[PDB]
Scaffold this motif. Structure first.
Motif, PDB file in Angstrom:
ATOM      1  N   UNK A 176       0.845  -1.179   0.000  1.00 38.29           N
ATOM      2  CA  UNK A 176       0.000   0.000   0.000  1.00 38.29           C
ATOM      3  C   UNK A 176       0.891   1.242   0.000  1.00 38.29           C
ATOM      4  N   UNK A 177       0.437   2.318  -0.657  1.00 36.48           N
ATOM      5  CA  UNK A 177       1.077   3.608  -0.401  1.00 36.48           C
ATOM      6  C   UNK A 177       1.173   3.818   1.108  1.00 36.48           C
ATOM      7  N   UNK A 178       0.088   3.491   1.812  1.00 37.86           N
ATOM      8  CA  UNK A 178       0.060   3.348   3.264  1.00 37.86           C
ATOM      9  C   UNK A 178       1.158   2.432   3.765  1.00 37.86           C
ATOM     10  N   UNK A 179       1.373   1.320   3.061  1.00 39.95           N
ATOM     11  CA  UNK A 179       2.371   0.349   3.498  1.00 39.95           C
ATOM     12  C   UNK A 179       3.774   0.934   3.392  1.00 39.95           C
ATOM     13  N   UNK A 180       4.057   1.624   2.286  1.00 39.47           N
ATOM     14  CA  UNK A 180       5.368   2.232   2.087  1.00 39.47           C
ATOM     15  C   UNK A 180       5.729   3.187   3.220  1.00 39.47           C
ATOM     16  N   UNK A 181       4.766   3.993   3.695  1.00 36.85           N
ATOM     17  CA  UNK A 181       5.090   4.971   4.735  1.00 36.85           C
ATOM     18  C   UNK A 181       5.409   4.297   6.063  1.00 36.85           C
ATOM     19  N   UNK A 182       4.839   3.116   6.319  1.00 34.59           N
ATOM     20  CA  UNK A 182       5.180   2.412   7.554  1.00 34.59           C
ATOM     21  C   UNK A 182       6.583   1.814   7.478  1.00 34.59           C
ATOM     22  N   UNK A 183       6.968   1.257   6.324  1.00 35.73           N
ATOM     23  CA  UNK A 183       8.372   0.902   6.126  1.00 35.73           C
ATOM     24  C   UNK A 183       9.257   2.142   6.208  1.00 35.73           C
ATOM     25  N   UNK A 184       8.873   3.208   5.491  1.00 33.58           N
ATOM     26  CA  UNK A 184       9.663   4.431   5.520  1.00 33.58           C
ATOM     27  C   UNK A 184       9.901   4.896   6.948  1.00 33.58           C
ATOM     28  N   UNK A 185       8.880   4.804   7.807  1.00 31.68           N
ATOM     29  CA  UNK A 185       9.058   5.271   9.181  1.00 31.68           C
ATOM     30  C   UNK A 185      10.027   4.383   9.951  1.00 31.68           C
ATOM     31  N   UNK A 186      10.077   3.096   9.622  1.00 26.21           N
ATOM     32  CA  UNK A 186      11.088   2.249  10.227  1.00 26.21           C
ATOM     33  C   UNK A 186      12.487   2.715   9.841  1.00 26.21           C
ATOM     34  N   UNK A 187      12.682   3.077   8.574  1.00 26.94           N
ATOM     35  CA  UNK A 187      14.012   3.482   8.135  1.00 26.94           C
ATOM     36  C   UNK A 187      14.408   4.837   8.707  1.00 26.94           C
ATOM     37  N   UNK A 188      13.438   5.736   8.905  1.00 26.58           N
ATOM     38  CA  UNK A 188      13.712   7.012   9.563  1.00 26.58           C
ATOM     39  C   UNK A 188      14.223   6.780  10.984  1.00 26.58           C
ATOM     40  N   UNK A 189      13.575   5.875  11.728  1.00 25.49           N
ATOM     41  CA  UNK A 189      14.042   5.501  13.063  1.00 25.49           C
ATOM     42  C   UNK A 189      15.492   5.019  13.027  1.00 25.49           C
ATOM     43  N   UNK A 190      15.758   3.957  12.257  1.00 23.93           N
ATOM     44  CA  UNK A 190      17.122   3.445  12.166  1.00 23.93           C
ATOM     45  C   UNK A 190      18.118   4.561  11.864  1.00 23.93           C
ATOM     46  N   UNK A 191      17.734   5.514  11.003  1.00 32.42           N
ATOM     47  CA  UNK A 191      18.657   6.584  10.625  1.00 32.42           C
ATOM     48  C   UNK A 191      18.920   7.532  11.788  1.00 32.42           C
TER      49      UNK A 191
END
Ligand SMILES: CCCCN(CC1CC1)c1nc(C)nc2c(-c3c(OC)cc(Br)cc3OC)c(C)nn12
Ligand SMILES: CCCCCCCC/C=C/CCCCCCCC(=O)O
Ligand SMILES: CCCCCCCC/C=C/CCCCCCCC(=O)O
Ligand SMILES: CCCCCCCC/C=C/CCCCCCCC(=O)O
Ligand SMILES: CCCCCCCC/C=C\CCCCCCCC(=O)O
Ligand SMILES: CCCCCCCC/C=C\CCCCCCCC(=O)O
Lengths: 263, 160
Positions: B58-73
């Protein structure tokens, strides 16, 4: 005889309606001009959402200025002559009418996106939807007017033709989609974001409340264009005066709405 | 806003793809597995998405992955002694520009901009901007770099 005096009375009430209509349009146009320059002055003119507001205001200025030019085509001599500048004035007025619907849809699209996804590049999408998409629709409608209904400066009402659906159908459709946006915004605001206070949440509940106030104000105007008033003297005069006040102050109401969301 | 920032200057993909080196990836550059089998790629995916198994998200799904990568960063930023103090001193907009650089060149890439980073921590943003621009980075992706730099100089979203 007594018919003529009943005819003279109507001319008064029609002439009074006309005066309400010129007055309202002058007040609306000044209110939109004041609201426009206020937006252009602020440094906040570079945020996406203020770009959207200012283009929305501009679209309503052009429609309300063009209304005055349209009045000079309602002459019976001009109306029947179907002169070229006469059809170009009508098309410009309908174009601006379509941009008013599509910029309100632009506002709805931005509000739905701002609460679901965390400026000068993204603006081009809204510019393209608000000014751009109506242009081919109006061209299509004008090709229609040319081969099937080329009369009366294209502002005729003729039973059986649906050439105007070419631009009226798109209007109803973007309204239908804004209704879906509104239910989901309310749905989201009242489940997931019930306890939230992001800046874009506070300002979003303000929008929803203002949209709920404006929506009936503007909605009556468009449903009344379908009522047959009736022959009661009280019925006619009131229908004519209520409609003239609501149609002509639309621009005023919108400028209030827009300035409210600036806060 | 930060999701749209990175969508803009990196891109968004909704079905799993292999990157330049051949690993399975999706969203805004979220690597799924260096395992060459798609089995492990889609598997790790649903373990993450926890949705009906599939290779489209989901476009929705991408943002939840994206938020995981923001955390790691951000975790990596605070672990780095040249980056921690600059980050802590910056407003939310300017922090976003710093996270943007880390997505493109990694933490140790950004730590190399020693002059500029001291400009930024001295809230001295004009002259930081001229430093960031004399670099191979600016020279290779100059449109992305101009947007990120202007965001440092003004602290607004005006360029995106
Ligand atoms: C002025 C020319 C056309 C104006 N107009 C017609 C009015 C009679 C109903 C209109 N057209 C369109 C496409 N949307 C709207 C809205 C609207 C909305 O409506 C469901 C939902 C959301 Br979320 C935001 C909204 O506006 C910020 C309003 C209040 N009016 N409106
Ligand atoms: C900054 C605010 C000052 C703005 C001044 C500009 C006002 C623009 C007004 C335009 C009105 C157009 C003329 C309408 C007059 C109709 C009168 C009539 O026909 O009887
Ligand atoms: C020799 C006189 C013949 C009579 C000519 C009367 C018409 C004169 C023209 C009036 C309008 C001028 C053009 C206006 C077009 C405006 C188009 C627009 O604003 O959308
Ligand atoms: C500030 C940006 C304003 C953008 C305005 C650009 C478009 C204005 C168009 C006005 C007239 C539209 C009607 C065109 C119909 C062409 C067919 C015809 O009339 O013969
Ligand atoms: C993929 C979805 C892309 C959607 C694009 C919407 C705009 C398409 C039509 C723009 C034409 C406007 C114009 O050229 O005048
Ligand atoms: C009368 C004009 C009302 C326009 C909507 C105002 C919304 C509000 O008061 O919050």
């Amino acid at each position: 005889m007594e018919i003529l005096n009943e005819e003279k009375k109507s001319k008064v009430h029609y002439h009074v309606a006309a005066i309400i209509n010129y007055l309202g349009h002058c007040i609306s146009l000044v209110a939109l001009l004041v609201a426009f320059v206020l937006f252009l002055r602020a440094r906040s003119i570079r945020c996406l959402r203020n770009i959207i507001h200012a283009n929305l205001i501009a679209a309503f200025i052009l429609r309300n200025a063009t209304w005055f030019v349209v009045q000079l085509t309602m002459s019976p001599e001009v109306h029947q002559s179907n002169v070229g500048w006469c059809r170009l004035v009508t098309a410009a007025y309908n174009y601006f009418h379509v941009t008013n619907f599509f910029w309100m849809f632009g506002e709805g699209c931005y509000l739905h996106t701002a609460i679901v996804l965390t400026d000068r590049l993204r603006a081009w999408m809204f510019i393209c939807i608000g000014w751009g998409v109506p242009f081919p629709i109006i061209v299509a409608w004008a090709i229609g007017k040319l081969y099937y209904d080329n009369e009366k400066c294209w502002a005729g009402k003729r039973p059986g033709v649906y050439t105007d659906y070419i631009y009226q159908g798109p209007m109803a459709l973007v309204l239908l989609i804004n209704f879906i946006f509104l239910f989901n915004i309310v749905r989201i605001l009242m489940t997931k974001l019930r306890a939230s206070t992001t800046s874009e949440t506070i300002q979003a509940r303000k929008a929803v409340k203002a949209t709920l106030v404006l929506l009936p104000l503007l909605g009556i105007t468009y449903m009344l264009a379908f009522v047959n008033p009736g022959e009661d003297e009280v019925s006619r005069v009131v229908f004519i005066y209520f409609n003239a006040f609501l149609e002509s102050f639309q621009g005023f109401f919108v400028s209030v709405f827009a300035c409210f969301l600036n806060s | 806003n930060i999701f749209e920032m990175l969508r803009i200057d990196e891109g968004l993909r909704l079905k799993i793809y292999k990157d330049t080196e051949g690993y399975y990836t999706i969203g805004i550059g979220h690597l799924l597995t260096k395992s060459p089998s798609l089995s492990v790629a889609k598997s790790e995916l649903d373990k993450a998405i926890g949705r009906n198994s599939n290779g489209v998200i989901t476009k929705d799904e991408a943002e939840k992955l994206f938020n995981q990568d923001v955390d790691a960063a951000v975790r990596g930023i605070l672990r780095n002694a040249k980056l921690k103090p600059v980050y802590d001193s910056l407003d939310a907009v300017r922090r976003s520009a710093l996270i943007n650089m880390v997505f493109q060149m990694g933490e140790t890439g950004v730590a190399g901009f020693t002059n500029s980073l001291r400009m930024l921590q001295q809230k001295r943003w004009d002259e930081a901007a001229v430093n960031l621009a004399k670099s191979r980075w600016y020279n290779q992706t100059p449109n992305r770099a101009k947007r990120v730099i202007a965001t440092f100089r003004t602290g607004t979203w005006d360029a995106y």
